[PDB]
Structure formats: structure tokens, C-alpha cells
Amino acid sequence: VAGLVPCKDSKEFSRRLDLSVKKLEQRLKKYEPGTPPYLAIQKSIETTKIRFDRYAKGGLLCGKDGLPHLITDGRLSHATEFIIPGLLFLYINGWIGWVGRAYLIAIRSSDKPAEKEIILDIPLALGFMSSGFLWPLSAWKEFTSGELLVDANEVTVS
Amino acid sequence: MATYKVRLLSEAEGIDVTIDCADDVYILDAAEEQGVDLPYSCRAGACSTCAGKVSEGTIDQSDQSFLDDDQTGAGFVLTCVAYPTSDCTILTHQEESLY
Amino acid sequence: MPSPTFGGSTGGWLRAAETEEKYAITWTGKKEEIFEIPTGGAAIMREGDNLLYLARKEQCLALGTQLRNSFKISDYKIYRIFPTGEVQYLHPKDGVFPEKVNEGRVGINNVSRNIGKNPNPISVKFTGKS
Amino acid sequence: NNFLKYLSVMPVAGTIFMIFTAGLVIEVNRFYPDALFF
Amino acid sequence: KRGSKVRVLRKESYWYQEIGTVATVDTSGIRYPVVVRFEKVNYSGVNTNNFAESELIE
Amino acid sequence: QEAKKVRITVDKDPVETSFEKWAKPGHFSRTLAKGPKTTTWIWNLHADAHDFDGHTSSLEDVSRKIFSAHFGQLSVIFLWLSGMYFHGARFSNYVAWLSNPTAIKPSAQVVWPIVGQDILNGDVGGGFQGVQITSGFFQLWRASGITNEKQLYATAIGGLVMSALMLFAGWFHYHKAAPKLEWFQNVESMMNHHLAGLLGLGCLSWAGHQIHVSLPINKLLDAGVAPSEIPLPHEFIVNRELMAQLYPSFSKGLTPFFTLDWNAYSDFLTFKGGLNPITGGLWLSDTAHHHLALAVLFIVAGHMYRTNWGIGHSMKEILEAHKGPFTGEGHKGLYEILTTSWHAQLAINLAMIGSLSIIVAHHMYAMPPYPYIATDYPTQLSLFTHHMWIGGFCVTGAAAHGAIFMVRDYSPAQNYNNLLDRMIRHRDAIISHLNWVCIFLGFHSFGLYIHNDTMRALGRSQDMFSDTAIQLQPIFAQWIQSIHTLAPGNTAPNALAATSYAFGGDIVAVNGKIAMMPIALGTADFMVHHIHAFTIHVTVLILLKGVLFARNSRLIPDKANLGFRFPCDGPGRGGTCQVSAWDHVFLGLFWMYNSLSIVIFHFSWKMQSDVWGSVTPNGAVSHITGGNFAQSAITINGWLRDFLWAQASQVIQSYGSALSAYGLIFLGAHFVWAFSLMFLFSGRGYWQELIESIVWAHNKLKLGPAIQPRALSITQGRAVGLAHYLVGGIGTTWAFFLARIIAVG
Amino acid sequence: DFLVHHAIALGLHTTALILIKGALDARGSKLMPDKKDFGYSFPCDGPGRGGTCDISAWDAFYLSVFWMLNTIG
Amino acid sequence: AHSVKVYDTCIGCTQCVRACPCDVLEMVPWDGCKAKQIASAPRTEDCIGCKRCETACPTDFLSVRVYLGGETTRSLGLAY
Numbered sequence A: 001v002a003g004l005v006p007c008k009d010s011k012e013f014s015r016r017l018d019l020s021v022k023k024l025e026q027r028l029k030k031y032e033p034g035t036p037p038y039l040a041i042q043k044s045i046e047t048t049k050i051r052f053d054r055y056a057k058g059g060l061l062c063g064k065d066g067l068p069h070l071i072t073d074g075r076l077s078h079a080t081e082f083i084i085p086g087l088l089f090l091y092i093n094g095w096i097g098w099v100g101r102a103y104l105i106a107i108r109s110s111d112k113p114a115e116k117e118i119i120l121d122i123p124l125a126l127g128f129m130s131s132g133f134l135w136p137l138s139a140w141k142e143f144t145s146g147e148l149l150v151d152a153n154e155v156t157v158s
Numbered sequence B: 001m002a003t004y005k006v007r008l009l010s011e012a013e014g015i016d017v018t019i020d021c022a023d024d025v026y027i028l029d030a031a032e033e034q035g036v037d038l039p040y041s042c043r044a045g046a047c048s049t050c051a052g053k054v055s056e057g058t059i060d061q062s063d064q065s066f067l068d069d070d071q072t073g074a075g076f077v078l079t080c081v082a083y084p085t086s087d088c089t090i091l092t093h094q095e096e097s098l099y
Numbered sequence C: 001m002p003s004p005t006f007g008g009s010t011g012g013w014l015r016a017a018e019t020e021e022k023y024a025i026t027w028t029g030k031k032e033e034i035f036e037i038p039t040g041g042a043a044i045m046r047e048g049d050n051l052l053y054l055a056r057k058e059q060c061l062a063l064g065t066q067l068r069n070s071f072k073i074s075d076y077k078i079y080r081i082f083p084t085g086e087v088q089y090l091h092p093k094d095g096v097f098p099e100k101v102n103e104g105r106v107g108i109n110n111v112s113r114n115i116g117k118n119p120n121p122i123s124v125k126f127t128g129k130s
Numbered sequence D: 001n002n003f004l005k006y007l008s009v010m011p012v013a014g015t016i017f018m019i020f021t022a023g024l025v026i027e028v029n030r031f032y033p034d035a036l037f038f
Numbered sequence E: 001k002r003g004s005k006v007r008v009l010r011k012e013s014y015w016y017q018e019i020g021t022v023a024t025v026d027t028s029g030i031r032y033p034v035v036v037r038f039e040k041v042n043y044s045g046v047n048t049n050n051f052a053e054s055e056l057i058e
Numbered sequence F: 001q002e003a004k005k006v007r008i009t010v011d012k013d014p015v016e017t018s019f020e021k022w023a024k025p026g027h028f029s030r031t032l033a034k035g036p037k038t039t040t041w042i043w044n045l046h047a048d049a050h051d052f053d054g055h056t057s058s059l060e061d062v063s064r065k066i067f068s069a070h071f072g073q074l075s076v077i078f079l080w081l082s083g084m085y086f087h088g089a090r091f092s093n094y095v096a097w098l099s100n101p102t103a104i105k106p107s108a109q110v111v112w113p114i115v116g117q118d119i120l121n122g123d124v125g126g127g128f129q130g131v132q133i134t135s136g137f138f139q140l141w142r143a144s145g146i147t148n149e150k151q152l153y154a155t156a157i158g159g160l161v162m163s164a165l166m167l168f169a170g171w172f173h174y175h176k177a178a179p180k181l182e183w184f185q186n187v188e189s190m191m192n193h194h195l196a197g198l199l200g201l202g203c204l205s206w207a208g209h210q211i212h213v214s215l216p217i218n219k220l221l222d223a224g225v226a227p228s229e230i231p232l233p234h235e236f237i238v239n240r241e242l243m244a245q246l247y248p249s250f251s252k253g254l255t256p257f258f259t260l261d262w263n264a265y266s267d268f269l270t271f272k273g274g275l276n277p278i279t280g281g282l283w284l285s286d287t288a289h290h291h292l293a294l295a296v297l298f299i300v301a302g303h304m305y306r307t308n309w310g311i312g313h314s315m316k317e318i319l320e321a322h323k324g325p326f327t328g329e330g331h332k333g334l335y336e337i338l339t340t341s342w343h344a345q346l347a348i349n350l351a352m353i354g355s356l357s358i359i360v361a362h363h364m365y366a367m368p369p370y371p372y373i374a375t376d377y378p379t380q381l382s383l384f385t386h387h388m389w390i391g392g393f394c395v396t397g398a399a400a401h402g403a404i405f406m407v408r409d410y411s412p413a414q415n416y417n418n419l420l421d422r423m424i425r426h427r428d429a430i431i432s433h434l435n436w437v438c439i440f441l442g443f444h445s446f447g448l449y450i451h452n453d454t455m456r457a458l459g460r461s462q463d464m465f466s467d468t469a470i471q472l473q474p475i476f477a478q479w480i481q482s483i484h485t486l487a488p489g490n491t492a493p494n495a496l497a498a499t500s501y502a503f504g505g506d507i508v509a510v511n512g513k514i515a516m517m518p519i520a521l522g523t524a525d526f527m528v529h530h531i532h533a534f535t536i537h538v539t540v541l542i543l544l545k546g547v548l549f550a551r552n553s554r555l556i557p558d559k560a561n562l563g564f565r566f567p568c569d570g571p572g573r574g575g576t577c578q579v580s581a582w583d584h585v586f587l588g589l590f591w592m593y594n595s596l597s598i599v600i601f602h603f604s605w606k607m608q609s610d611v612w613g614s615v616t617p618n619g620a621v622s623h624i625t626g627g628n629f630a631q632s633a634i635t636i637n638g639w640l641r642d643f644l645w646a647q648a649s650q651v652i653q654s655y656g657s658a659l660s661a662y663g664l665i666f667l668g669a670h671f672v673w674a675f676s677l678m679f680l681f682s683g684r685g686y687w688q689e690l691i692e693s694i695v696w697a698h699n700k701l702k703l704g705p706a707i708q709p710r711a712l713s714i715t716q717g718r719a720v721g722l723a724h725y726l727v728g729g730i731g732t733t734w735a736f737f738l739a740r741i742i743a744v745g
Numbered sequence G: 001d002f003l004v005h006h007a008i009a010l011g012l013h014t015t016a017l018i019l020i021k022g023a024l025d026a027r028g029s030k031l032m033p034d035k036k037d038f039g040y041s042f043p044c045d046g047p048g049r050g051g052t053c054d055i056s057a058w059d060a061f062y063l064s065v066f067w068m069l070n071t072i073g
Numbered sequence H: 001a002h003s004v005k006v007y008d009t010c011i012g013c014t015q016c017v018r019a020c021p022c023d024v025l026e027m028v029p030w031d032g033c034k035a036k037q038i039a040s041a042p043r044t045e046d047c048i049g050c051k052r053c054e055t056a057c058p059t060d061f062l063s064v065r066v067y068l069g070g071e072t073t074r075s076l077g078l079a080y
């Protein structure tokens, strides 16, 4: 569906479950049970099995080479593969994009602003930090207040 | 803005004045505010014409870019980046004295 | 204006066959100082007048500038010796250093505008101007 | 002042923040490995 | 004009359409009789400049 | 006279140990103490961190900054040595390695299983999992004779407390008691204690460790005793008669040494030479004999120079009396040169400790010192190559400060007609005859490699330079190997075995694996040594041009007035790009990598073809690459095909294995190498105008910094393309060498 | 094939990036406001004002043939 | 055969003549600022174009433009 087959029921994807643990069990049969290198392999056996049960219940969409694939055609059924990772990404990318701008206005209204960019005012840098989970309803207000963008006849230009 | 006194003297012309300055104001700006002409080029610390010699006192001359380490070891201060942090007496017209 | 004198040194890195331009930086000293020849090495600097033949004018000025800073003497003169033998008296140009302001004003290569006020190179088409 | 204000120089105030913000990504990969989604 | 901040209008400088800070206006018929200082230093490391009286807008 | 003027002259409490100059950086110079108006200030904060001559003209407080900073360097060595001995204790298989060191791989790193990075911990035997490791401490700890796991845990806590003393000593010598310049200019006494009380006692007490500990341990290890069943190192000291059951000379005692019957100690201080076929390495009784041989005449060479008590060769007087007819005034003036400027002293010290470490790399592979390092071909490859590159890097630093001294601390008034001045006077004939011989060598070394490549391409194989062709037999290098096989018996009559088995004699093989085979120098080594003679000559062509044209040239007659490290003197005189003595080091560092990569490629192909491999009990020898250096080494396609393309197959067919970390570094350092050429081919004025677009994108958004974001400066921009190139030129040779020999061997 | 067209579209935009810089900054800038009076192919402006290697629009052309061969490669 | 013409900003900051190691810059007294001097360039035929005036030139942008045109054996700096 949506092109290729789901990997919830895929023989090549289930073969990649098979020969990987068959490769990894061949390392297990040269040790003895009870040693700490034995427990390091058998714990690494189950984290590959549960990984192969994570992608089965996740509903990833791939076939013909036994891999998982991802769909970025804006699909709301496939929103867990790209969209809500990006929606948490673009959330507090916009922290650091906004509180770096918020830090760089109160530092300009100082005595010596040149030293203060590498010698931090940590009560002001943390003082402008935690107003960053609520950026874009204030940044859009900043966009329509007017002073987010200076006028073109006062910028540095060639 | 504190208060400081600089006794300037040019013996080639023969003018001895006592000017008053602050911590942010330059020395020749206080000389122009008392009506004393002094040689200068662009007020940057990057020429040689505005050179004075510190006879007595203590001068923050650190914002200049023309004079090197040894040439300021004899006490040659450009009067346009100078923050006078003490009560001083300065010989001026030392533009040929640095080189 | 030139005269036969000496300089007093030894060297092995100097002018080649050169016959388009040479000179003589001639000056009077005060002591037997030791100075770097600008092509390398050292010399002994006899206390009267003494001269140096070198190749090109960068070596001639950088010996005249080195003589002004260390063991300060404002009396170095710079000629130019042609292959035919003519002299020039190049550097002070009338008895004084050019950082001092003259009374003879020639005033050439002096454009009378700001550096933005210069025409476009379409306006200087197939001719020679800035 | 002046020792905690030595811990406001941009490398060292960066690095004890970079020790923090690296290890935030390390220890969420401890408890939730192998994540293509959510 | 003494004192306060003066914006520039000439091009070909580092500080173009910037804030400016005027000092000691000259009266001699010199073409560029203001020696206005700036913050935010240029490529030469010179935070000051002199230009003419035709580029003030204050 | 200096009859009481060798004494200590110490200031008490010079600098208050405070915090206010500790957090206001750039505090060592006038040009950096007034804050970052530009972003040149951050890159000048790191470049002027150790440029102490640009901080103060007082040589007394320059030399106190040197002596305290060495203690900070030496504390880093003890902290790093504590990391090696502690990871031998808690994170190792060394105690399992001593029971069978012929097939158990070394391991000193257990990776945390976090991101699925646990696949790098390979099955290296011993009931233990971990990263296969190749610095070779395991054969060092068998050479010193550390048996159990407790002694590695005690040394690293004994090494950490040696760092805490050494870090405290630099604190004491800058903040409580600092020496003066009278103390540092007593160089006739410093060479006394360094020859005698540093290297002599460094040998003689180490000869005490080898005879009393490492010889009874390594006489009982190779017999077949388990390391739990060997008596302790403090049982070979308090029990003299237990040593008597190994060497019968210890039943006598100290009376042969005191009464000079020194031939009674021949049973444990021998001159065997060669190898030890039981344990795979040097005879340890020879090494125990070698150290107190150096000790008893380093301390003899310690008392050479003039001291407080009258006697001694004065260093000012032996230099002054070496004048000659060609050399003018001789060395009159060089003693005042070397006891004023550290850069003059660093320029001689770096060429020596550089080119002693190249002697270390060559006197280790063909004479394997440590037991059971002979079979471990990964440790021989990594201990060769690492001692090359340190000797390759520290030799270009000898011409760094050889040129920094000339522009800073060379006064020509003190150097009239002496030996340093005379080569500035004839500096054309130095470089031009070096300029001729590089074109002579590179036509006669690299031009033959084209000439064998064309003749193989043109079909006519009888017109190249090979064994079955026009032979270029290296008859000098084939002769000295025939001398050292007559060095037993004939020329050094008391040496029983050979000086080294690389010159000839017999094979030595340990548990089937070949310890050392005789290297047969053939006609493919006449050319590759001439490659090595060519690219060494080009590195001294750039660097000696950097020293002799550091003061001035015919381009610039006042080059020293602009400084050492400056970009240019304008595009006039046709262009003066890369004209400083900094750029001669920057150009000379590149040909060092273009030199030393060939030396380790000559190492990694000849020793993979002629000495290493396997030995059948009949005596049949089968090498790794089959001995393909006789034919395929003579052409540049053969260096591409049979060596570069063929031996990298173990690197790139190594995913899913424990060597898969090396394949990531093998792609890591292709990337950083082709990150260098952005910094190297481009200029500055492009990027500064490209940054000029981005400052518009921030000043539109009230986002511009109060500091000025600038492009990197030109010497700084050449330096970042230099260091990227030498990470990506070395790191992929690192990741191909280690991934090949661990896989195939 | 999804990822490798983005390797092309990296090189399509970057070779555009040097040359739309190379077109539009032939005339002037802040580093050199009178670049038009010097010409298309001049060496540099010297080491002054920070240093000015590869400032010309010819040297702004020069970097893209590296990126063109990187892109079509 | 260069062309090192000096523009109208030209404050008489006498260091371009100092930084010139070929004496092709020369101060000329001229009606203007408080320094009352301008920098003149007589020896354009004698210059090398090594741009040493422009590095010590604290105007808005470059009172002494340098712009390099023609050339000879003097300007190319050969000792042979």
C-alpha cells in the first residue's frame, strides 16, 4: 500500500530478523554461560529482537529488500515517521532562534557589549532562557508589532 | 564622569595650560573645550601627529593601533584614545619624537 | 654629486649583471657601528662618508630606513647610476624628507572627488581612464 | 564573584552546557533505543 | 550639529545607514568638517571617520 | 670567574595566585587586553597563547613562563601514563594474555553498549570482549615483568600521585619561588646533571630493575611456569639464593664487580645479540647489559663541562677555538646565541628529538625489543608509523623556530663574520645547489617509475628497470648486509649471534609465525630509497629557504620588519603571496606528509611481502602478499593496483565486524581531507563578502552581534587548511593500516 | 535515489551560490566599494583591511569549477 | 607604470609616506583640514605597487587608491 508492501508481513524483512540473530548466535557459542562477555551478547540478542518487534507494531512501509522505509508525502497515517519528529524539532529549534535574539537586544543596551558576548551574564542568559517554550505566539506578535524587521533605509548595505 | 587635571605645555610655541577632563572624554577634546589647538589627524589612535609625552601621571592609552610596545615604553601617548585616569602633566607636540 | 668612497664589508649575495639601473646610497656616519646589509650579512660602517652599491631601489630605501631608526642619522642621500654613467639624486628630491611638508608644491595625481564619485567603466569605452 | 564569573566564559559555559546537552541525547537512547518514529 | 547621534547618507564607507556619534564640527571651509565616531568597528580596525555635512539626517 | 655564581637566584612569591586575571582573557598582550571588537580577537587569543616573546621584553619572566609550563606538560604525560596502566587493570585481558600470548589478541577498551556500538568489542580471546588494541603496552609489561593485575592498578595510582606532584611543582615555580635569568644561563651545569643524573641514573637504576626483576621473571615465564606460580619481585631481592638457582653468579655476590672480575657476570650480562626464539624478541640479558653500559659512560660524559669546582671544558671556550680558513671567525658568538633565546635552543632540540624518534622507528622493527611483539604484526606496524610521524612533525618545527629566532633574536651586531652570518652571505649557493639536486633526484627517482609504467603499458617489458630487465642493483646496500653477517666471529669477535636478522643469517619463527626473516634488498629498493632521498631533499629545500631567507631577500629587503608570520608585502613585485618564513613551514609540512606516507608505504608493502607470513615445520615459507614487491613495486600502477587497491580490501569489506570502527575513520578522513581544500584553495576576500550577505540577514532581524563577524585571516586560513589536510592525510592511512593487518594477520 | 538527487541539488544551489555572488558582487561591496574601477580579472586588493585574497569576480568564478566538477561528478 | 592617485578625503595623516618603502608618496601643503597638507604621488613611474599606503590609511575608504596598471623592470622588482 502507498507503493510497496508493508513490512509487518514481509518475508525479506523477516529474513533480516533470521540471519542477523543467526550470525549473532554464532558468536555466543564460543563463550561459556555465566561470564560477563556471555551476558553482553545475550542482552544484545534481545535488543535486536525487540527492535524487530518495534518496527512490526510501528507500521513501517517497506519491501523487496528487507529494510524499513519512510513516506514524506504529507501522510497523516505516516505522520509518526517525519512530521511529529519535525514538529518537536521546529518547536525548540525556535527556542534557540528566539532566545538568542532575545539575548542580543538587552546585551546591546549595556556599557561594554563586546566583552559580554563571550563573558556571559548567566543570570541574564538564563534570565532570557526559559521564556522559550512560548516563542511563536510572541514572535508573530513581534512580526506585527513592527520592530522585528528594521526599515530598508537603515540597514548595513553596499 | 570624574574630574582630572592635565597640565599641557608646548615649549616650541610656548603655551602652558591646565585643562580639566573626565574618564570618558579624550584629552584633546578637553583641550578643544578650553580653547587650545593641538595637532591631530582623525582621532583614532592610528596616526603619529597627535603624539604627546607623559612627563608625570598615568594614562590609559590602550585603545590605539599605531604605536607599538617599545615606542610606548618611553611614554608616548596619542591624545585621542587617552583616558586620563590620574592628575597628570603632559608634554605635547611630540609627533617627531616617536620616530 | 657622486664621489669615490667605499663601504667596508664582505658579501656574496648582491647585484648580478645589471646594466639598466644601479645607484649609491651615500651617507656620513658617526661610529663603527655594525649594520645589516639589506641583501644580507653585516658591515663595519666607517665613521666618515661611505657608500653602498646595490641592485634595485627597495634595497636602497630599506637601508636608508634602517639607518634612520637605529643609530639615528638624517643625512642619507640616494643617487641612481645609469649604465651610461648619469646620476639622478632620487630620494629626498629637494634637501628634505617627504614626510616633512615642502614649500615647493607640485601636486600631481590628485583627483578632487570622493572615491565613490568615479564614473562607470561603460563611460570609459575604448580609451584609458579610471 | 570572579570564579563563578570564570564559569561564564563562552567555552566553559558552553562545555558544561555541552556536557549536559550531549548527555540528554545519550540517556534517552539508553531507555528508548532503536527509534525511527514517535 | 554637536552632540547626539547622526545617521549617514554617503555610500562607499563601512558605516552606511548606521547610527553615528558626532564630535567637534569644524569651521574652516574644509570639505569634510565633521569627524563623527562610531561603534561596530570597520575592516581596518578604525572606529572613527570623517565625512561631509551633506550626509546628516540626524 | 663564576666561583660562587652557579648558585640559585630565586625570587620569593612573584605572582599572587588570584582569580581576576584568570577570567579576563587576552591579558598577555596590549593588542588583546581591550576586548573583542572583531572576531580576529578569538583566533588571536589561541594563536598568542604560547607566543611569550610577544608578551614581555623581560627575558627573566619569559624564562619563568617556560619552566613552569614544562611541569604542566609533564603532568599530562603522567596522567596519560595513568590512563594506560589503569586500563590494563580494570579494562583488560592482560592477566589472561600472559598464559598464552601467541594467539590471544591484546585488548584495552570495553565500549559501553549504547547506540549499538557494542559490535566493536570483538572476540579477542581470554574469556574477554573488547577493542583490539595496538600501542603495545602488553609486551612492555611482559618486558618489565608485571605479572598480576594488582601491579597495574598500583602504578596508575602511583602515576596519578606523580602527576599531582608534577602539577604542584609548576605552581611553586611561578607563584612562590621563581628562578632568575642567572639560574637559567648556567648551561654548563645543566648539561652536567642531564647527562649524568638524568640519563645515567635513568639507565643505571633501570639496569637495577632489569637485572633484579625483569630477568628472573622472563627467565621463568618462557620456561612455562604459570604467572600465578612465579615468585614475587620482592622475593628476587631479599632472597639472593633464589636468584642463584637461575644465574650462579649471584652466589658469589658483589665482589666480582668491586674487584673487577667482571667476566664472572657473563651469565646474565651477555653479548648474545640477535633474537630469542623462545619468547620472540631481544635477549633481555643483552638489554640488561645495554643499559648499564650507557650508564657508566653517560655519567663519565656527565662530568665534562665547567662547574663550580674549577675543572671542566668551558662551553664558551671549545666553541671559540674552532675557527678555520674557510669558516671565517668560527663559532665566536654562538654561546651567547644559545643562552639568550629559547627559539635558538628549540630549533636544535626539535631536530634531535625528532630525528632520534625516526631512529626509534628503524631500530625497533628489525630488532624487536619486547617479548612476544615479533608475532604481533599490528603492533610492529603501529609502533613504526607513530614513531615516524612524531619524528616527521618535530623536524619541521626545527625550521619553524630556526626562522623565528632570525626575525626576533638575531642581532647582526653580535654576529660579525661568525658562522651564522656567513651563510646569510652566500645563501644563493646553498639553495640553488639544493634546487638542482631535487630536479636531479626527482627525474632519477620518480621518472623511472613512469619509465617502468610506460614500458609495461607499451608491451615491451624488457625495457623497464627490474630484475629481468635493465637492472639497477643497489650494490652499496646489498654489501653492508654482507658485512653484518660477518659481524659475529670476525669483526666483533665476542658477539655470538648476529647484530640483527634483517641483514641475513637465518629465519626466526615463533609458533609458526615468522619473527624475523632476512630482507633481500633488490632493484625495486634502489628506486624507492631514491624516492626517499628525493622527497627528503625537497623538504629541506623549502625549510632551509625559510631559514636563510627569513631576514630579507631580493623580493623583500626588510622582511624581518613585518614580522615572522605575515601574509605578504602586497601583490606588487608581481605578487608576494606566501612570502614569509611561516609559509615555508606551511609549504614544508605538506611535503613531509608527501615524504612520510611513502616511507610507511614502503614499510607496509615490503614487510607484508618478504618477512611476515607463515612457516611450515618442513621449512616452507609462505608470505602474506606472496612476495609481489619483486615485480609489482616498480610501477606507479603497481603501487596503485597491488598495494593501494588490493590491501584496502580488508578495510572496506569489514562492516558488521569488530574492525568496522576503522571503516568509519577511513571514510572520516577522506572527508576532512576534502574539507581542507575549501580552506586551502580559496582566498579570504570571497568569504568576507559572503559573510557580508549574512550580516545583512541578521541586521534586518536585529540579530547582528556586537562583535564583528569577520573572515579568518590569511595565515590563519592557511593554517586551518594545513591541519585538516594532516588529519585527513594521516587518519586514513591510520584507518587503512590498522584495519588491514588486524584482519589478515 | 532520494538522497543522491539532494547531493545534486546541493551542488546545483552551491554552484549557483558562488556565481550569483560572482555576478552581483563584481561592482562593489563593503570590503571593496570600487571593484568596478579595477576590472573583472585583477589579483587582489592587498593584505589591508583584514586581507583581500580572491576578491575579484574572476576569482569568484574560479571557485565554481571546483564545484561544477563536484556537481557533475 | 602604475597609477596611485590620491583622492579628496586626504587628511594629511603622514604615515602613507612613512609606510611607502619607495618614496613615491610625498606630502604637499594644501588648503583643507587642520593638518593643511595633502599626500601627492610624483613617482608613479618609480612605484612597485606593493600597496603599503593602503594598510595605513584610516579614512572612510582609502584616501590613496593604488590601482595597478602598467609595469616595468622597476615595478616588478628584479635584481637582474
Ligand code: CLA
Pocket: A096, A097, A098, A099, A100, A101, A103, A125, F693, F694, F697, F698, F701, F703
Ligand atoms: C543567536 C543565534 C543565531 C540565530 C537566531 C541565527 C539566525 C539565522 N542564521 Mg545564523 N549563525 C549563528 C547564530 C545564529 N543565527 C552563528 C553563531 C553562526 C556562526 C557559526 C551563524 C552562521 C550562519 C550562516 C553561515 C548562515 C546563517 C543563517 C541564518 C538564518 C537562517 C536560519 C539558519 O539556517 O540558521 C543557520 C544556523 C547555523 C548555521 C548553525 C547555528 C549556529 C549556532 C549553533 C546557534 C547559536 C547558538 C547560541 C549559543 C545561542 C545563544 C543563546 C543562549 C546560550 C544565551 C537565520 C536568520 C543563514 C542565512 O543567512 O539565512 C538567511 C546562513 O547562510 N547563520
Ligand code: CLA
Pocket: F066, F067, F070, F071, F074, F183, F184, F186, F187, F189, F190, F193, F194, F196, F197, F198
Ligand atoms: C640530577 C638532577 C636533575 C634531574 C633528574 C633533572 C630532570 C629534569 N629536568 Mg632539570 N635541572 C637540573 C637537574 C636535574 N634535572 C639542574 C641542576 C638544573 C639547573 C642548571 C636544571 C635545569 C632545568 C631546566 C631549566 C629545565 C629542566 C627540565 C628537566 C626535565 C626534562 C624532562 C625529561 O628529560 O624527562 C624525564 C622526566 C622524568 C625523569 C620525570 C621524573 C622527574 C623526577 C621528579 C626527578 C626530578 C629531580 C629534581 C631535580 C629534584 C628537585 C629537588 C626538589 C624535590 C626540591 C627533567 C624532569 C626541563 C623541564 O621539563 O622543566 C620541568 C626544563 O625546562 N631542568
Ligand code: CLA
Pocket: F046, F047, F048, F049, F050, F051, F052, F350, F393, F394, F395, F396, F397, F398, F400, F404, F565, F582, F585, F586, F589, F723, F727
Ligand atoms: C617542542 C614543541 C613545540 C613548542 C613548544 C612550540 C612552541 C611554539 N610554537 Mg611551534 N611548532 C612545533 C613544535 C613546537 N612549537 C612543531 C613541531 C611545528 C611544526 C608542525 C611547529 C610549527 C609552528 C608554527 C608554524 C608556528 C609555531 C608557533 C609557536 C609559538 C606559539 C604557539 C601557540 O600559541 O600555539 C597555541 C596552540 C595551538 C594553536 C594548538 C593547535 C592544535 C593543532 C591544530 C593540532 C591539533 C590536532 C589534534 C592533536 C589531532 C586532531 C584533532 C581532531 C579534532 C581532528 C610557540 C613559541 C607560532 C608562533 O607565533 O611562533 C612564535 C607559529 O607561527 N610553531
Ligand code: CLA
Pocket: F435, F438, F439, F440, F441, F442, F443, F446, F447, F450, F538, F541, F542, F587, F590, F591
Ligand atoms: C604530483 C604533483 C606534483 C608534481 C609532479 C610536482 C613537481 C615538482 N615539484 Mg611540487 N608541489 C605539489 C605537487 C607536485 N609538484 C604540491 C601539491 C605542492 C604544494 C604543497 C607542491 C609544492 C612544491 C614545492 C614547495 C617545491 C616543489 C618542487 C617540485 C619540483 C621537484 C623536482 C622534480 O622532481 O622535478 C622533476 C619533475 C618531475 C618528476 C615531474 C614529472 C616529469 C617526468 C618525469 C618527465 C617529463 C615528461 C616529458 C618527458 C617532458 C617532455 C615532454 C613535454 C615537453 C611535453 C617538481 C617540478 C620543488 C621545486 O620547485 O624545486 C625543485 C619545491 O621546492 N613542489
Ligand code: CLA
Pocket: F671, F673, F674, F675, F676, F677, F678, F681, F682, F690, G010, G014, G017, G018, G063, G064, G066, G067
Ligand atoms: C568535502 C569537502 C568540502 C566540504 C564538506 C565543503 C563544505 C561546504 N562548502 Mg565548500 N569547497 C570545497 C570543499 C568542501 N566544502 C572545495 C574544495 C572548494 C573549492 C575551493 C569549496 C568551495 C566552496 C565555496 C566557494 C562555497 C562552499 C560552500 C560550502 C558550504 C556548503 C553548505 C553546506 O553543505 O552546508 C553544510 C555544511 C557542510 C557539509 C560542511 C561540513 C559540516 C560538518 C559535517 C558538520 C559540522 C562538523 C561537526 C560539528 C563535527 C565535529 C567536529 C569536531 C572537531 C568537534 C559547506 C560549509 C558554500 C558556502 O559556504 O555557502 C554557505 C560556498 O559559497 N565551498
Ligand SMILES: CC1=C(C/C=C(\C)CCC[C@H](C)CCC[C@H](C)CCCC(C)C)C(=O)c2ccccc2C1=O
Pocket: D014, F678, F679, F680, F682, F683, F684, F687, F710, F711, F712, F713, F714, F716, F717, F718
Ligand atoms: C569557509 C572559509 C572561511 C569562513 C569560515 C568561518 C567564518 C568559520 C566559521 C566556523 C566557526 C569555527 C564557528 C565557531 C562557532 C563556535 C564553535 C560557537 C558555536 C556554538 C557552540 C558549539 C558552543 C574563511 O574565513 C576562510 C579564510 C581563508 C581561507 C579560506 C576560508 C574558508 O574557506
Ligand code: SF4
Pocket: F567, F568, F569, F570, F571, F575, F576, F577, F578, F714, G043, G044, G045, G046, G047, G051, G052, G053, G054
Ligand atoms: S592576500 Fe593573498 S593575494 Fe591579497 S595580497 Fe596578501 S597574498 Fe597577495
Ligand code: SF4
Pocket: H006, H009, H010, H011, H012, H013, H014, H015, H016, H038, H039, H053, H056, H057, H058, H059, H062, H063, H064
Ligand atoms: S593615507 Fe589616507 S589619510 Fe593618510 S594621508 Fe594619505 S590620504 Fe590622507
Ligand code: SF4
Pocket: F570, F572, H004, H016, H019, H020, H021, H022, H024, H025, H047, H048, H049, H050, H051, H052, H053, H054, H066
Ligand atoms: S604603492 Fe606600494 S609603495 Fe607606493 S605607497 Fe602604496 S604601498 Fe607603499
Ligand code: FES
Pocket: B040, B041, B042, B043, B044, B045, B046, B047, B048, B050, B078, B079, B080, B081, H013
Ligand atoms: S588623530 Fe589620527 S589617530 Fe588620533
